Amino acid sequence: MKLEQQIQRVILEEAKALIKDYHEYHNRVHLESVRNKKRLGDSAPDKKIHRPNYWSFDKKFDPFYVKSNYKSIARSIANKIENRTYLPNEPFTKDVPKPDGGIRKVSIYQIPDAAISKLFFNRLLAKNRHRFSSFSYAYRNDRNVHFAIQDISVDLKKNERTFLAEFDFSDFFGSISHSFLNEQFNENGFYISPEEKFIIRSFLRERKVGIPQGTSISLFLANLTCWKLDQDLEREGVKFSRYADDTIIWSQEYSKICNAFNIITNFSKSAGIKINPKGISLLTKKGLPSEITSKNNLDFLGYTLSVENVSIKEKSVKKIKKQISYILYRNLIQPLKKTSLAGQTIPANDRDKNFLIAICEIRRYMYGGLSKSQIKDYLSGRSNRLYFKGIMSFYPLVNDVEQLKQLDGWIVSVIYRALKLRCQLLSKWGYNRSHNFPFILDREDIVDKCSKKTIAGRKLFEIPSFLLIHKALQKGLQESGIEKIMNP
Amino acid sequence: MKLEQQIQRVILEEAKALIKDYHEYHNRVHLESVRNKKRLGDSAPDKKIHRPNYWSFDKKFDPFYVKSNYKSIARSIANKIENRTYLPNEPFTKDVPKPDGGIRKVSIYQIPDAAISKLFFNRLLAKNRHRFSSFSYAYRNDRNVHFAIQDISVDLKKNERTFLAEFDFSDFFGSISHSFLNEQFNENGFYISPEEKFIIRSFLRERKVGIPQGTSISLFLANLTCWKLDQDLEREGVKFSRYADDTIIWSQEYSKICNAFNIITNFSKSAGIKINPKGISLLTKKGLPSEITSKNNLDFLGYTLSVENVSIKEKSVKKIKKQISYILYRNLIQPLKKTSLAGQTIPANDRDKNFLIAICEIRRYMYGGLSKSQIKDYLSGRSNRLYFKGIMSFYPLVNDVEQLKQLDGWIVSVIYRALKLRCQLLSKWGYNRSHNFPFILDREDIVDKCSKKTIAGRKLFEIPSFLLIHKALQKGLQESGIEKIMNP
RNA sequence: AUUCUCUCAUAGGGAUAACGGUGUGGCCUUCUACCUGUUAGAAAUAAUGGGUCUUCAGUUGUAAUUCGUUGCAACUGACGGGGGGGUGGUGUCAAAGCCGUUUCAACCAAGUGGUAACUUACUUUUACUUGGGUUUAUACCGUGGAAAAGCCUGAGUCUAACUCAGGCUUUUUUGUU
RNA sequence: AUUCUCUCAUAGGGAUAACGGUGUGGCCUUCUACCUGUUAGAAAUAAUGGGUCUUCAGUUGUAAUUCGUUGCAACUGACGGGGGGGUGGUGUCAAAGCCGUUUCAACCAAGUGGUAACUUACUUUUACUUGGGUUUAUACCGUGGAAAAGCCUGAGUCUAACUCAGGCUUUUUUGUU
């Protein structure tokens, strides 16, 4: 297995995956444009298939070109690696505003360079896995971050008073002396072959200072740089998790968190670059007071973790409500707020097709398309497996039944109100349909009536409920674990 | 995928693997009996193919029978699990003397019971991995124990003064209250489904107190039982590793290790059972003195780990010397110490076939059959891969060049002496062969002369050297990691 | 050309129109309680078309119990928010409260100084689609072929005007279907 | 029978001799520096049969250098234990030492009170074999078939002795080869 063959394999697979993604993109756009023509009638806009802009910045960004000449590309890359002259091209970078007001520098390396990064740094991470800390993650969408969440959640329950502290490592990775990184190469038992060291130094040479964030090589260089910080924090007895440019350190003692603050400062001085807290607080059982500045809720990604429950962050709930509300608006209000209703099917005969489309869209967003019969078959024992998709697949550790119950109420209320305004607009256009099924149900009757309706023998009107799929999530986490439900 | 199909799959694979092992056993016995006939002439004994004795204690121990009726076996097992009446049969247990004077209770569950144990407890371990400690192992032959060794080794180098302590958990697992285990079932974020809880309780019910050791279910129940001991020790800042019924806890502080002793005692009291040290010492750079009782070497499995190097334990070096010495004795001395030399080829014509057989046996035991040309091809860059087998595959973390150099000298000296006694015995029989190649070389000439000799164009007389394959092992650890060399 | 093939190959050459995918339905097969017409049939069932619950907690009875708990009834306790404006009881010495009655509100909004819009969208990542595989129809990205229309340039007769040649843009059918 | 197939199946029924593997060599193909006969051949190489090194550290010169370091020479520094008995120099006021010279020792043994044995072996596990896959020969575990020998039991003539039937043990060839 020569290096050229490995490069050819990896580059071909990366380009093939990107080509499959583009194909599915334009196919999806066409299907959506068919449905949008049906929805918005003549007013419906026309399809506009885009191509990722960076594809034109360089030809090796474009997956199709790379697939065209991946053998030559890999041939030259292999020669460059063997002659120790390889240097990755410039990543197409785009700095993006962050909610704190900073900039998250997105970096897209060209397909050959990203293929090399995966091929080498995945091997390095696999071979040095036991040398790294437990909860170190590179992306904030990393599925395995949920394990860290679990840990903190468990502690926040068992420890009824936990001192926490949060930190931002953005400037560390933006400007970390490459000398420090190169010093760490032969410490802590790391196994980095000479060629792997050359590739590391080459990706660092294409850069000048800092580690490229949100990339294949991010996790390795981050763990390699932060190995001593992890070791000191582990000796202090503090528990910690780094995700992307954030770090959370929790303990049952105040002295420990203060000593961790000192450790982080000393490691920053050793690095020649500073780490700044977002900073320090105490989480306690709700109702119980606190001595230091305290907060009874911690925002960990899309989770609010408290000593009592794990819930969905308020921003995540607002986003879920935004998506459901826009589904109902797009399907039941927007088409009827257009200048003309030419080619827009009007609800009649006790059938509103737009309402079926909206309910199914909400079910896909929430359940993934599961029926309440399927979820109950899984919850009873009839079914030995349920596919977990939709929004709740991203919040598998939620255990706040009240939040889900409130969202159920909100879904029903918004369905009623949107249907009511749809009736109002329809009557404005000239169609009186208040007596028809979609518009006659009271809010306290929508769920029952919809549960009873059946089209094609399948109950496709049942209003999706968060609590049912939450029960299913709990059973599936007691049966498979986080990893299985997050990815099947 | 129904439970019966899963059970059939696992039982069939277990039985099939055991049948493959037996087939290879008797085939090896035949090949060895051919070679032994050629070696010991008429005095060579006759073949005696055995069958594992426990196969006759019950018919479900025998792989052939289990393969005969694995469908009915799995059918009944699945019904028993679904009706919550399944109880594993009695393991064929055999207490064995331990070097400390204790008894290691070997337990072999019947093939269906062991297949169920794997099927369920491997799933449990996979789904609760991140809830367990890093260096927790069930068997002392577990390959991954080497990672824990790496950790301690690294610390013992970086920390030039390390307080260590060792403990024996044998009585803990021999008698642990099953109530304590059952209490831990719903703590620490563990995910144990009701059926997995039933299987755990069933294997515990077949037992009365204690966890069956050296079994598929050992690691899960041990980690589930010791999870609070691990959490307490991790909060104390002590690092630790449990392997089978042993635990090593190390720190850079004396207070920490004493507090760990207190933690272990408290956990013992909570368990209703005592954990006793083998106990406490300081490892320091050689030459430097110590306050407390100190030792500059720690025996971790077949390793002696010191602040300066990782070496092979003295018992392991004795075992290696025993194997090499017996190879030379069996091939070059034993045949000639028989009553008659009927059918035993006598060295002549400057060719001793027995010496070729012995050198090749030593090469297999040491290198795995590698030629020095192959190892140097790998060490130069010519070859991109070398298979790592033989004795040194079990000691991949050795970095003591002096020990290997001394073993090289010992190999050459023993070869010279065994060949000399072979010449003496041959002359006693009537064959004068001191002038011939095998018996004319001085000890300072054996390696060179043998290196030059070639049969079939391949240098099969070269005296195997530990230092060459040690260099190869270091390169393969910097190129692949522990896991890759340990198992290809 | 995103196909196929050559160059000591992160770039350049050629040769052919194909390659790569998407929704629906079909078979295969993974797992799926009960009651039912009506088709076959001798009560063994299968495809079909209609319907019901299916979860969690406690109490009690019962059986096992290695003293963690476990199977079965069978009774109730939850199992679809919040807010604004009016309005009845409560429920107190007033009043918080909290029971219910009607209207308003597509969401953010239980809020902004104000409240609309938006899904190929905003974004620290807010990210994914209906167990696995394969073929009748409707398709899709690019490329190729054909036609039509418009514009520009050049040439011949030449006042006009007509004809031809080249280039550019747009729109339609197909070989993958 | 360890093969194939049936029983509401951790157990029982049947039907056939096969099933499951091992060493060697062959092709396929994964990676492999240099110099060479002698076979083909027009110097392009291929199968073959002989040979050499291939690692690490420092110094110095040189080129790059984001100031971690990196490519290339080219010089030396290691790159095959220990012990017992004699014996020479050193190397000191003696002496430890430590240079080398010869003998003894299969290992443990640089030790036990003593020193032999052992590999289907001892054992806390001291545990594995030659990159992946497949077919000419030599085989293997079990099972089946055939023959021979020995022993026991029963029956017929019966003093003996002979014949037949049944059971048990052992050893040899084969269908997988």
Contact B320, B409 (CB under 8 A): no
- Strand D–CB B269 distance below 7 A: no
Cβ distance of B478 and A2 shorter than 8 Å: no
How far B270 CA lies from chain A's nearest CA (Å)? 18
Question: Where does residue A374 fall: left (phi above 0), alpha (psi -120 to 50 degrees), or beta otherwise?
Answer: alpha
CA angle A17, A22, A23 (to 5 degrees): 95
- Strand C–CB A357 distance below 7 A: no
Residue A361 touches chain B, beta carbons under 8 Å: no
Half-sphere exposure of A434 (CA within 13 A, CB side): 8
From A147, A188, A479, residue closest to B193, measured CB to CB: A479
How far B192 CA lies from chain A's nearest CA (Å)? 6
Which residue numbers of B belong to the known binding site for dATP? 98, 104, 170-173, 276
Beta-carbon contacts of residue B109 (< 8 Å; ≥ 6 apart): B88, B89, B91, B117, B212, B215
Report CA-CA distances (Å) from B314 to A57, B396, B470. 64, 16, 18
Identify all chain A residues contacting B150, using CB atoms and an 8 Å cutoff.
130, 189
Half-sphere exposure of B181 (CA within 13 A, CB side): 27
Residue whose token pair is 């507090």: B259
Residue A424 touches chain B, beta carbons under 8 Å: no
Half-sphere exposure of A169 (CA within 13 A, CB side): 27
- Strand C–CB A68 distance below 7 A: yes
In DSSP notation, B127-181 reads: HTGGGS-TTEES-TT-TTHHHHHHHHHHHHHHSSEEEEEEEE-HHHHHS--HHHH
The alpha-helical segments, DSSP class H, found in A178-313 are: 178-184, 194-206, 218-225, 227-235, 254-271
Strand partners, A94: A106
Report CA-CA distances (Å) from B289 to B161, B255, B286, B336. 10, 19, 8, 53
Closest-CA residue to B63 (of B102, B94, B18, B127)? B18
Nucleotides of strand D lying closer than 7 angstroms to a protein CB: 1-4, 7, 9-12, 20-23, 30-33, 49-55, 66-71, 79-82, 105-110, 117-121, 123-131, 139-142
What's the full length of chain A, in residues?
Answer: 488
Q: Is A282 helix (H, G, I), strand (E, B) or coil?
A: strand
CA angle B87, B88, B91 (to 5 degrees): 150
Report CA-CA distances (Å) from A195 to A81, A83, A190, A227, B483. 8, 11, 14, 22, 20
Q: Å resolution of this model? A: 2.6
Q: What is the CA radius of gyration of chain A?
A: 27
Beta-carbon contacts of residue B205 (< 8 Å; ≥ 6 apart): B87
Contact B14, B118 (CB under 8 A): yes
- CA–C1' span, A154 to D89, in Å? 78
CA distance A470 to A404: 8
CA distance A120 to A192: 10
- Any binding-site annotation on A276? yes
Cβ distance of A481 and B147 shorter than 8 Å: no
Contact B215, B107 (CB under 8 A): yes
Edge to edge, the sheet with strand A280-284 lists A136-137, A239-243, A246-251, A161-168, A280-284
Q: What is the CA radius of gyration of chain B?
A: 27
Residue A130 touches chain B, beta carbons under 8 Å: yes
CA angle A485, B3, B8 (to 5 degrees): 125
CA distance B384 to A5: 13
Q: Which experiment gave this structure?
A: cryo-EM
Nearest residue to C29 via alpha carbon and C1': B1
- Strand C–CB A420 distance below 7 A: yes
How far B204 CA lies from chain A's nearest CA (Å)? 21
CA distance B312 to B307: 14
> Which residues from 347-386 of B have any strand D atom under 7 Å from their CB?
360, 364-365, 368-370, 372-374, 376-377, 379-385
Closest-CA residue to B165 (of B51, B264, B301, B231)? B264
Closest-CA residue to A199 (of A59, A3, A2)? A3
In DSSP notation, A423-475 reads: HHHHHHHT---TTSHHHH--GGGHHHHHHH--BTTB---PPP-HHHHHHHHHH
At residue B60, what are phi and psi to the nearest 5 degrees?
-85, -5
- CA–C1' span, B43 to D171, in Å? 21
Which chain B residues in 168-197 lie under 8 Å from chain A, judged by CB atoms? Answer: 188-189, 191-194
Strand partners, B303: B300, B312
Which nucleotide across the nucleic acid strands is nearest to B371, CA versus C1'?
D130
Cβ distance of A130 and B126 shorter than 8 Å: no
Closest-CA residue to A98 (of A278, A293, A306)? A278
What's the full length of chain B, in residues?
Answer: 488
Residue A5 touches chain B, beta carbons under 8 Å: no
CA distance A178 to A191: 19
Q: Is A91 helix (H, G, I), strand (E, B) or coil?
A: coil
CA distance B321 to A155: 52
Report CA-CA distances (Å) from A148 to A136, A228, B176. 9, 20, 30
Contact A363, A450 (CB under 8 A): no
Cβ distance of A189 and B151 shorter than 8 Å: yes
- Pairing state between β B310-312 and B303-305: antiparallel
CA distance B270 to B226: 11
- Is the C-alpha dihedral spanning A120, A122, A126, A132 positive or negative? positive
Residue A83 touches chain B, beta carbons under 8 Å: no
Beta-carbon contacts of residue B196 (< 8 Å; ≥ 6 apart): B120, B123, B124
Spacing of C-alpha A448 from chain mean position: 34
